Design a protein around this ligand. Structure first.
Ligand SMILES: Nc1ncnc2c1ncn2[C@@H]1O[C@H](COP(=O)(O)OP(=O)(O)OP(=O)(O)O)[C@@H](O)[C@H]1O
Ligand SMILES: Nc1ncnc2c1ncn2[C@@H]1O[C@H](COP(=O)(O)OP(=O)(O)OP(=O)(O)O)[C@@H](O)[C@H]1O
Ligand SMILES: [Mg+2]
Ligand SMILES: [Mg+2]
Ligand SMILES: [Zn+2]
Lengths: 644, 418
DNA sequence: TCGTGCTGAGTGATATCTGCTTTGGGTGGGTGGGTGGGTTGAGGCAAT
DNA sequence: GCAGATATCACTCAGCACGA
């Protein structure tokens, strides 16, 4: 009676709004043509339903158990009538695949958090926002079994039900397959024609900021089924919409004796809203080519990164060169010539080392800032682990392994323990890690690039000593780093004023929005100033000095480029250009290496650096052949990196 | 038990299968010869190639006598067509041609005596699986065959443990991964044989689940007419057993999404495929993805969640001489010719190890390479050390915590010095 | 000399019933699951 | 739905005394 009335009401509502009918038709047509598979689900906006009929909206918001299933049935009937499949299949005929519903729009007081969920919100539709901490394994759940009776030659079926699968309660159906027919004929289960749906339980934790002072975070369990099975990972921020429910006897049954503990409450998820690479268009490639043709682009790209920092321009150049890397050669003998540059920074305190690390982290596609001092969380290198009691062996990947074909930005390289030093030596030398511990034998690639910072041992860099003396790592570790940079904090009055004012600006800078300086506190999920950057004295600052060539008086506004497009530039260069060494550059490479070695300990490995940087620079010029200019500029950069 | 009208007919499919085993011709019919070999006890595994089924279907359609799509039926529900193929083979089995032994055949004396007793009683049987001595396996549909005849291959298309969801249950699929655990071969009982101490009659019980309940009282017509309460006792000499192995397959490093951990899928191996999987191996295993329904009280308290597994059906494995063989130790390195000669001598491991009345002389040519940083030592070391079939590159510190030679450590869990 | 109808007695099969957990611990596992629970401290030995 | 421990009821058999 009431069920039919609500089904008719939702059918009328769907008829009124043609957008949902169009969406269902589009999903069905896409599924039919592709015969990767679109799920049977429709997203409705609570605002439209409220406008159409307030009673149904209030019922869904306050009594979902009695108002949702009718909507699902109406949508299923609409889809079935709209379906035009000429010939189904045994899998499709017996499949238990109704059409599910999901909700968007504006919620009232029902937009809560895991802490605010109390007993007064049960049996109501709510929207919970938080952080995922746990994610159980994906498991199949039985909802229909189809059997075959050979004697009578007829297919029988049976439906199961569980508390976590239906909003409306029914008598539990134990998972025991029927074995004999009502007439007594023996049955055989047809496994291919049954219906199993996935099941996953996740735990959402309150956002740390919202947590009241002196209170531990609270969490609520969520159950997801079918298509919404693998959509979240631990640590992600999500906005889950579902029906708050209570399950189990909760000690009310005579078997239990606690008589104080309460019932178990979870959320039946309806949808999850989440809270790398940019697909290049046709004209973005034209723009990148336009910049490449300009015969000054190297300076522009170098100084676009970290524009705030004063000085240290050669470091920015080298960091860009590292980001774009060099071609990696794989010889037929299995030999693997390294093609990834490495950089190490050593200098006195307060030289923006952490700022450079942050900027490379922001501009790099991949990066992990696992500090070398007791890297709690993710270890620097892989190391198997076992449980305290169960002894569950498992290979936990470290920072180096988690940066394959990317970058790892180590911090405070001078705080490393002997274990980390020994691990890192092997990792860089071999580029791969082979674990042979706890009965586990495996090999994991570690091809990547390493940038690290290391303070001196006495707290200040001494010029009279070699860099290998101001740092206390063995030659084995330092030799792996292709380029070593030594930077000192020099005091210049004008520089002091500039740094002071730049740092001061932020403090007086405010959170615009509330009485200036007082107690301080996505719309959708489915989804030429663009290239160049307008000059900003607040941020760029020193970038102007860069084009001025150390002249403060110089007012040459530079042609800086926004970071978002610079990431696209690096992406396009790294994924499309494979430069090949050329004789013209190679004469100068040989001559420069010979001059370095025989005339004012330089090692043969520095030759590898010249070729690597020549190819890397040739990649900047968007050319498939390394030219004399690339070799000369790489040689000059190496000369600076060796001799001041 | 409401009934549905599925668009599948099993009588027609069985007739097609029976015709397939007697008409296909890749020499007489291929599968007729294969069965003839089995009847002589020379073969104990019949492998049905779905490519052959597709070829037979296309040949029939070309003639105009179109029939049902058997290939799609097999993959959609594979656990049922094993029985159909076994029944067809039993029906069309040929008589042996080579003289068989028949001497030490427990399930030939048992059956002969059972026939004699039944004939004598009636004048005044056994389950089909018991007599079977062959195993039926399915070979997936190769991509080349599918593209040749304009079809899509779902079984052969490799997947990952992540992509094996509940929708694939009951189908023939392929999984790509690395084996990480294997178990010892154990006998899984298929048909139990009992003996009544009173009748002299044998009672056979089929077991097709993880658990079974033994019989106690005889059900023979002799114990019924006389209503004697004879006791049945198990006899392992007449039962039927099949080798059983349980393994684990894990995802490769190339299939785990960022921020996710590898998953593992259990594999069950029955019949002759046992021992074809070993730890630490990359394989392409095709099998039937089936659930394992619980039994007893566990079923009620377990819930609707189903523990699944894979029934392996096919496994595919992812596999001046002196001066010349010296300058080729690391062609990339330039100098150090004599050193390279020495490393070649090391590779050969030249010795004819001599053991007389107990004396043992080492047969290993140790070598060291000192010098200064810059000369090609480490590159030489890794090249020379990759050349050999077996090698281990490590620093002077050792392999992780344990140093070079050996070390005894307290067990984290068992607290036993290991 | 003896044959048979009535009786008390005792098993056999079958009716209801409780129970379907149970349990602390890693040679029971983690595809059995945390609403079924597990919260040391001294002493010996390898590494160094 | 399933196995095990337990108690209930109904049916049939060997002895007994009398009458043939
Ligand atoms: N060239 C520069 N231009 C502007 N600010 C700079 C420059 N060099 C250093 N600074 C200032 O130095 C301050 C200190 O930076 P940071 O804490 O990263 O120093 P660090 O040398 O890496 O530190 P540590 O010595 O602790 O390892 C930053 O706030 C930055 O403003
Ligand atoms: N004869 C040569 N031919 C080719 N490359 C050479 C030669 N001599 C030296 N090199 C280069 O010298 C560089 C030295 O780096 P390498 O990895 O060999 O370190 P190493 O000093 O030998 O190692 P270690 O001291 O740690 O044992 C390598 O890139 C190698 O290519
Ligand atoms: Mg710092
Ligand atoms: Mg070395
Ligand atoms: Zn008997």
């Amino acid at each position: 009676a009431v069920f039919g009335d609500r089904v008719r009401r939702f059918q009328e509502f769907l008829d009124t709004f043609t957008s949902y009918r169009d969406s269902v038709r589009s999903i069905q047509v896409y599924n039919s043509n592709n015969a990767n598979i679109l799920p049977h689900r429709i997203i409705i906006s609570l605002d439209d339903l409220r406008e159409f009929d307030r009673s149904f909206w209030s019922g869904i918001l306050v009594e979902p158990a009695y108002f949702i299933p009718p909507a699902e049935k109406a949508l299923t009937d609409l889809a079935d009538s709209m379906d035009d499949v000429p010939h189904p299949n045994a899998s499709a005929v017996s499949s238990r695949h109704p059409w599910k519903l999901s909700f968007k729009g504006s919620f009232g007081a029902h937009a809560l958090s895991p802490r605010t969920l109390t007993a007064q919100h049960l049996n109501k539709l709510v929207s919970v926002e938080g952080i995922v901490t746990k994610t159980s394994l994906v498991r199949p759940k039985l909802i229909r079994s189809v059997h075959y009776a050979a004697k009578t030659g007829r297919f029988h079926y049976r439906d199961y039900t569980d508390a976590t699968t239906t909003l409306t309660t029914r008598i539990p159906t134990p998972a025991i397959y029927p074995t004999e027919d009502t007439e007594g004929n023996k049955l055989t289960t047809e496994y291919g024609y049954s219906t199993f749906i996935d099941h996953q339980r996740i735990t959402v934790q309150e956002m740390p900021e919202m947590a009241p002072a002196g209170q531990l975070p609270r969490s609520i369990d969520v159950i997801l089924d079918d298509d919404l099975v693998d959509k979240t990972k631990p640590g992600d921020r999500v906005n889950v919409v579902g029906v708050f429910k209570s399950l189990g006897a909760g000690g009310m049954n005579q078997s239990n004796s606690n008589t104080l503990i309460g019932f178990k409450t979870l959320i039946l998820g309806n949808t999850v809203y989440p809270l790398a690479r940019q697909m290049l268009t046709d004209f973005d490639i034209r723009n990148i080519n336009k910049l490449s043709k300009k015969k000054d682009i190297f300076d522009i790209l170098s100084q676009s990164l970290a524009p705030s920092i004063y000085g240290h321009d050669h470091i920015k150049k080298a960091i860009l060169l590292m980001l774009m890397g060099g071609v990696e050669k794989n010889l037929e003998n299995g030999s693997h010539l390294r093609g990834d540059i490495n950089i190490l920074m050593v200098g006195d305190p307060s030289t923006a080392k952490s700022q450079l690390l942050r900027f490379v982290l922001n501009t790099a596609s991949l990066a992990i800032a696992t500090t070398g001092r007791g890297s709690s969380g993710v270890g620097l290198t892989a190391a198997v682990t076992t449980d305290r009691e169960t002894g569950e062996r498992r290979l936990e990947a470290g920072a180096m392994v988690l940066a394959d074909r990317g970058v790892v930005c180590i911090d405070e390289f001078d705080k490393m323990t002997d274990v980390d030093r020994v691990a890192i030596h092997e990792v860089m030398e071999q580029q791969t890690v082979t674990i042979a511990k706890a009965g586990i034998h495996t090999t994991l690639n570690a091809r990547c690039s390493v940038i690290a910072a290391a303070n001196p041992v006495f707290g200040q860099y001494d010029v009279n000593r070699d860099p290998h003396q101001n740092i206390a790592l063995p030659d084995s570790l330092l030799s792996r780093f292709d380029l070593l940079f030594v930077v000192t904090d020099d005091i210049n009055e004008i520089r002091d004023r500039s740094i002071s004012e730049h740092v001061l600006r932020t403090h007086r800078y405010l959170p615009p929005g509330y009485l200036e300086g007082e107690p301080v506190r996505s719309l959708a999920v489915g989804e030429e100033d663009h290239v160049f950057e307008k000059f900003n004295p607040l941020l760029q600052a020193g970038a102007k000095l860069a084009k001025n060539k150390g002249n403060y008086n110089g007012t040459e506004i530079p042609k800086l480029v926004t970071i978002p497009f610079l990431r696209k530039y690096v992406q396009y260069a790294k994924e499309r250009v494979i430069p090949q060494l050329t004789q013209e550059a190679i004469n100068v490479i040989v001559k420069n290496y010979t001059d370095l070695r025989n005339d004012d300990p330089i090692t043969a490995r520095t030759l590898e650096t010249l070729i690597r940087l020549a190819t890397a620079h040739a990649k900047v010029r968007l050319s498939k052949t390394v030219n004399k200019v690339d070799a000369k500029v790489a040689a000059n950069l190496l000369r600076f990196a060796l001799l001041g | 038990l409401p009934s549905i009208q599925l668009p599948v007919d099993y009588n027609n499919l069985f007739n097609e299968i029976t015709d397939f085993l007697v008409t296909f011709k890749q020499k007489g019919p291929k599968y007729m010869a294969m069965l003839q070999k089995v009847a002589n006890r020379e073969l104990n595994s019949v492998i049905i190639d779905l490519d052959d089924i597709l070829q037979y279907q296309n040949e029939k359609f070309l003639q105009g006598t179109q029939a049902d799509d058997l290939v799609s039926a097999i993959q959609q529900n594979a656990n049922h067509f094993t029985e159909l193929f076994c029944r067809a083979i039993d029906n069309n089995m040929p008589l042996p041609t080579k003289e068989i032994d028949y001497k030490d055949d427990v399930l030939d004396v048992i059956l002969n005596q059972r026939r004699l007793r039944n004939e004598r009683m009636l004048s005044d049987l056994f389950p089909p699986n018991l007599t079977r001595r062959y195993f039926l396996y399915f070979k997936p549909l190769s991509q080349n065959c599918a593209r040749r005849y304009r079809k899509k291959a779902i079984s052969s298309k490799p997947l990952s443990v992540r992509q094996i969801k509940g929708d694939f249950l009951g189908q023939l699929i392929t999984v790509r991964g690395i084996i990480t655990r294997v178990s010892d071969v154990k006998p899984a009982v298929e048909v139990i044989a009992y003996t009544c101490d009173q009748c002299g009659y044998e009672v056979f019980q089929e077991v097709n689940s993880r658990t079974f309940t033994p019989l106690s009282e005889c059900t023979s017509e002799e114990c019924s007419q006389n209503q004697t309460k004879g006791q049945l006792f198990m006899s392992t000499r007449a039962s039927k057993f099949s080798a059983f192995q349980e393994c684990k397959i894990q995802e490769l490093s190339q299939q785990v999404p960022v921020g996710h951990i590898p998953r593992s899928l259990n594999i069950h191996v029955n019949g002759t495929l046992v021992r074809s999987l070993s730890p630490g191996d990359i394989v392409d295993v095709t099998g039937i993805f089936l659930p394992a329904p619980y039994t007893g009280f566990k079923a009620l308290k377990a819930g609707l969640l189903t523990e699944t597994y894979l029934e392996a059906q096919f496994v595919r494995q992812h596999k001046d001489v002196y001066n010349r063989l010296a300058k080729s130790i690391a062609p990339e390195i330039y100098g150090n010719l004599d050193v390279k000669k020495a490393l070649l001598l090391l590779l050969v491991g030249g010795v004819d190890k001599r053991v007389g009345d107990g004396m043992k002389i080492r047969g290993d040519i140790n070598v060291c390479l000192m010098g200064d940083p810059g000369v090609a030592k480490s590159q030489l070391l890794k090249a020379i050390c990759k050349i050999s079939p077996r090698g281990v590159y490590t620093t002077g510190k050792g392999s992780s915590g344990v140093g070079l030679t050996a070390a005894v450590m307290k067990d984290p869990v068992t607290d036993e010095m290991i």
